[PDB]
Amino acid sequence: MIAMVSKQPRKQRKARYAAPLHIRQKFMGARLSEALTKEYGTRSAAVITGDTVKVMRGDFKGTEGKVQSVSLMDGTITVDGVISTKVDGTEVPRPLNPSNVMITKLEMKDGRRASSIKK
């Protein structure tokens, strides 16, 4: 969250850079699929470790996979199949920005998730 109090680039970027962890949770938002947006009433939700997303920007557009890991400080997620093979040849995950993906199936093992997504 950064209000229209400050339209200045420096203040916006300072707010994002020094965001608390509970504000960095909201930075993990991603677009919901049409079915999910219809059946939740909201347009977006935070990408969580476990839910299935489709990558829609970058070198891995079209891939569907489960979120392996989320970093709040980096603001990146790791998706099954989105990897960077290194000079060894071992496969390493390539971190993705959550705004570059779309949630197609939510992980709802947490009873608090529904109210977390809306309200």
Partner: protein, 252 residues
């Protein structure tokens, strides 16, 4: 003299007699004075801090050491405090106590405003000013334009009036400017498209507010810089019936 009024569908549904503000001769010099004065009165004080480059106790070595006579640190040869020393004070910097405000007499400011209002009626000035339009100037709209509350209604009115092309020109002509202004917060160079003037505070202020390049104001809040952006008169403007009625002795 007289001007037709167009309903929301764009068809002329009557006549209005233009006030005496509209037959005022074209005075670009006075318009330039008024706009420059308003811009200057908007400006904000700035400058370096009080003792910037000067909070040292540096003193000169004098002659006999093979060095310039500039002040130096008491425990080093590093020069200090002088405008040609690194870290030294700015000679002649901007001062926060400088007064940038300009005065224009109320009579000649009103003359400039009247000249800019009359310039909204000349097609040559308006098209030369940059606007794209197909209407017949001046554009007087029936008062029901003031009661419409959504941007879509304004779009329908502007399309029926042949004015929406100017809004599209401002929207697609919005460009990221060159230089330091982007970091300071002026990322875009915006265009001006359409001025809507209303009789009083009405829903059309919010309804037309978000249109690209569009300004919506009332007759009370009408000044030279709205009618002559960048000191250039010939702004494409939509007047309402109430605005024309309220303009009878507005700046005379």
């Amino acid at each position: 003299a007289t001007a037709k009024t167009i309903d929301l569908t764009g068809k002329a549904v009557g006549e209005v007699e233009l006030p005496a503000v509209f037959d005022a001769d074209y005075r670009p010099d006075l318009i330039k004075k008024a706009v420059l004065a308003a811009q200057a009165n908007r400006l904000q004080p700035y400058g370096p801090r009080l003792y910037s480059g000067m909070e040292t106790s540096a003193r000169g070595w004098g002659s006999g050491r093979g060095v310039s006579h500039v002040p130096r640190l008491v425990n080093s040869s590093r020069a200090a405090r002088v405008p040609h020393a690194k870290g030294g004070r700015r000679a002649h910097p901007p001062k926060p106590e400088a007064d940038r405000s300009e005065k224009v007499n109320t009579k000649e400011r009103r003359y400039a405003i009247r000249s800019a209002i009359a310039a909204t009626t000349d097609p040559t000035l308006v098209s030369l000013r940059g606007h794209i339009f197909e209407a017949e100037l001046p554009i007087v709209a029936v008062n029901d334009l003031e009661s419409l509350e959504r941007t879509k209604q304004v779009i329908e009115f502007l399309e029926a009036a042949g004015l929406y092309e100017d809004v599209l020109r401002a929207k697609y002509g919005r460009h990221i400017r060159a230089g330091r202004g982007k970091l300071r917060g002026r990322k875009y160079k915006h265009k001006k498209s359409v001025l809507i003037v209303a009789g009083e505070n009405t829903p059309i202020l919010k309804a037309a507010r978000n249109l690209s390049g569009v300004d919506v104001v009332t007759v009370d809040s009408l000044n030279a810089e709205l009618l002559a952006p960048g000191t250039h008169a010939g702004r494409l403007t939509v007047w309402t019936e109430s605005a024309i009625g309220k303009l009878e002795g507005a700046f005379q």
